[PDB]
Amino acid sequence: ATFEIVNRCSYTVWAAASKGDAALDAGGRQLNSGESWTINVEPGTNGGKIWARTDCYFDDSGSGICKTGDCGGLLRCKRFGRPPTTLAEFSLNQYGKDYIDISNIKGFNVPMNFSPTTRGCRGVRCAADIVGQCPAKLKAPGGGCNDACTVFQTSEYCCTTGKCGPTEYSRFFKRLCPDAFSYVLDKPTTVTCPGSSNYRVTFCPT
Numbered sequence: 001a002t003f004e005i006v007n008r009c010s011y012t013v014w015a016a017a018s019k020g021d022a023a024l025d026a027g028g029r030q031l032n033s034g035e036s037w038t039i040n041v042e043p044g045t046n047g048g049k050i051w052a053r054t055d056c057y058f059d060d061s062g063s064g065i066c067k068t069g070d071c072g073g074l075l076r077c078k079r080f081g082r083p084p085t086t087l088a089e090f091s092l093n094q095y096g097k098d099y100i101d102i103s104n105i106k107g108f109n110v111p112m113n114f115s116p117t118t119r120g121c122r123g124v125r126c127a128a129d130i131v132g133q134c135p136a137k138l139k140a141p142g143g144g145c146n147d148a149c150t151v152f153q154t155s156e157y158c159c160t161t162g163k164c165g166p167t168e169y170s171r172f173f174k175r176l177c178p179d180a181f182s183y184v185l186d187k188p189t190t191v192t193c194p195g196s197s198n199y200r201v202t203f204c205p206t
Helices: 148-152 168-176
Strands: 002-007 013-018 023-031 036-040 048-053 087-094 097-103 112-116 124-126 191-194 199-203
Touching: 002 013, 002 023, 002 048, 013 199, 023 036, 023 048, 097 112, 097 124
Parallel strands: 002 199
Antiparallel strands: 002 036, 013 023, 013 048, 048 087, 087 097, 097 191, 112 124, 112 199
């Protein structure tokens, strides 16, 4: 499957693509404002994620640091990124279908649209100014809006027991972005697409 990753932000981002235990494609690349990077994701990929990283520095070997979404200091991510990260999440060719969503469960750093480029389903979008409106207690000093689990480490926020409800913090994410997950047990906003669809992830869609 192809994923065209497009940076419409006015700032550079470093795109990242991983399934947690391995890179997807090259795993990461710089995207200056307006640039597009097309990756190939193996069919059957389960639990893939794409995100943006901000304010990154890499040496000639591809080692460094990002303020948001850092994946073990690598340009080419092999693992998931450090919150806060708005997440484009996907599982492909799962009993003949693809499943896509956006999640704010690991916080928000950059607004995102995640849409098919092929027929048969709709896209999802989280493009509100979550950083600007972020509750004081969730503001990440390194940049972005943390989720409550990252900040407070409670069973309730982290859904450790598989019993948890919405919270004042999850309702903030859900108010600003109804079509993204706001907490682990949120009413799903997953979209079912035909198996082997292709996609575009657009940072800063509006």
